[PDB]
Amino acid sequence: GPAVGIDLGTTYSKVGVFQHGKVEIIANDQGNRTTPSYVAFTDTERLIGDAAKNQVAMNPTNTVFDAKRLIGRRFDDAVVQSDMKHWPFMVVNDAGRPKVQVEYKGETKSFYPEEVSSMVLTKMKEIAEAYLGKTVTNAVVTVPAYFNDSQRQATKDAGTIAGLNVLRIINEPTAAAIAYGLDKKVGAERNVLIFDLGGGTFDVSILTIEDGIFEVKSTAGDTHLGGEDFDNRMVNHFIAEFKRKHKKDISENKRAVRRLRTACERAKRTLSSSTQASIEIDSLYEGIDFYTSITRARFEELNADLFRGTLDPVEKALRDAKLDKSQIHDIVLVGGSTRIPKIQKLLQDFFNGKELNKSINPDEAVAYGAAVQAAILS
Ligand SMILES: Nc1ncnc2c1ncn2[C@@H]1O[C@H](COP(=O)(O)OP(=O)(O)O)[C@@H](O)[C@H]1O
Ligand SMILES: [Cl-]
Numbered sequence: 001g002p003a004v005g006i007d008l009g010t011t012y013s014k015v016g017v018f019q020h021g022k023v024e025i026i027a028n029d030q031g032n033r034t035t036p037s038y039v040a041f042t043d044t045e046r047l048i049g050d051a052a053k054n055q056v057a058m059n060p061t062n063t064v065f066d067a068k069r070l071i072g073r074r075f076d077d078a079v080v081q082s083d084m085k086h087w088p089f090m091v092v093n094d095a096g097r098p099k100v101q102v103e104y105k106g107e108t109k110s111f112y113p114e115e116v117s118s119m120v121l122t123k124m125k126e127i128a129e130a131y132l133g134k135t136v137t138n139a140v141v142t143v144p145a146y147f148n149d150s151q152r153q154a155t156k157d158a159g160t161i162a163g164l165n166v167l168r169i170i171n172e173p174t175a176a177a178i179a180y181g182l183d184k185k186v187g188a189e190r191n192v193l194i195f196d197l198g199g200g201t202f203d204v205s206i207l208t209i210e211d212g213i214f215e216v217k218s219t220a221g222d223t224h225l226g227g228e229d230f231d232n233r234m235v236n237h238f239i240a241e242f243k244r245k246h247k248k249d250i251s252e253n254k255r256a257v258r259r260l261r262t263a264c265e266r267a268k269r270t271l272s273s274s275t276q277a278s279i280e281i282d283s284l285y286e287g288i289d290f291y292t293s294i295t296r297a298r299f300e301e302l303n304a305d306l307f308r309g310t311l312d313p314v315e316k317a318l319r320d321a322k323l324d325k326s327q328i329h330d331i332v333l334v335g336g337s338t339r340i341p342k343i344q345k346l347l348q349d350f351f352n353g354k355e356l357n358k359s360i361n362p363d364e365a366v367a368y369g370a371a372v373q374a375a376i377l378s
């Protein structure tokens with residue numbers, strides 16, 4: 001094609017292409033190596049990726065996200081019913097199948113989860129095409145190891161709808177392992193642990209690889225734990241701070257809260273590299289500017305319990321896999337949240353000082369491996 005590898009994430013998607021023995025993680029029109037898995041509908045346009053997330057604060061009812069949580073599921077599923085209570089957009093029942101309902105150009109419309117995801121995949125396809133200067137058709141699309149046949153089918157369908165010939169649907173943890181060349185034959189079998197902390201989900205997977213063949217020994221995690229939760233802790237902290245300094249509560253002003261949230265998420269990223277971050281919001285509430293800062297130490301404290309809690313699924317995966325810490329040959333960090341120094345410390349300490357595979361940007365590892373596999377299947 002070349003064929004490309006696409007990581008269709010719950011919160012952010014990435015696309016990579018293997019060329020001249022190297023993988024290239026493609027930046028979008030805004031220079032971003034990751035693209036929000038968001039799609040927005042307005043009185044006049046359909047926005048995707050950065051354009052959609054950048055206006056979520058002002059158009060919450062018609063800005064769709066989390067389509068990956070619905071893809072391949074039935075409307076009556078307990079998780080679907082639970083998730084619906086937290087989404088600002090409407091989810092309706094079409095013959096037992098869930099559909100997101102929105103307003104677009106003054107008319108009510110509904111889309112199957114795979115249709116929303118096809119929109120995100122189309123964006124990823126275009127991003128690759130703009131980079132390559134060639135039409136992109138063949139692709140390998142990844143999915144969480146626990147996805148069933150229906151979820152895998154619906155994901156493949158999203159690709160097909162986007163105009164992609166999905167060469168194969170592979171597991172995200174496996175893709176991450178492939179990125180580090182852990183699929184190469186060295187003789188005996190090897191046990192690898194994938195620690196994936198994304199935007200809204202946490203996945204731990206233990207793979208046993210031998211002769212280039214992968215076996216998923218165990219999976220653990222929390223489908224409702226990720227970077228967003230850390231942002232939440234920061235938001236509450238700053239709402240308290242603003243209330244203290246201005247005797248005003250912004251909690252009910254949706255916009256103000258989303259603006260603070262965006263500022264928090266950004267400050268969070270900075271804290272992975274620096275020990276302090278500045279938050280400066282012009283007229284956050286009733287014309288009041290909010291200029292402040294937060295230290296890495298404070299950020300760690302606000303999230304201490306959540307960070308520490310990531311180790312429980314690690315111990316569980318190990319027990320389910322019938323393996324001791326020492327039997328893990330490689331630990332691979334995946335997901336943007338694993339860039340947090342405290343998380344890396346916790347995991348390494350748990351593994352008694354064992355080195356972590358973190359040379360490939362964690363949030364790019366899945367796409368990286370997917371691109372390699374795509375080239376192999378091409
Ligand atoms: N440098 C960083 N430090 C801390 N968190 C980060 C960093 N980069 C990205 N993140 C967080 O990673 C999350 C997105 O992770 P990602 O693995 O891309 O998600 P998914 O693949 O599950 O959609 C967001 O919560 C984002 O804030
Ligand atoms: Cl773009």
Ligand SMILES: [Cl-]
Pocket residue numbers: 179180181
């Ligand atoms: Cl490597």
Ligand SMILES: [Mg+2]
Pocket residue numbers: 009010198335366
């Ligand atoms: Mg991911």
Ligand code: NA
Pocket residue numbers: 196197198199201202203335
């Ligand atoms: Na994850």
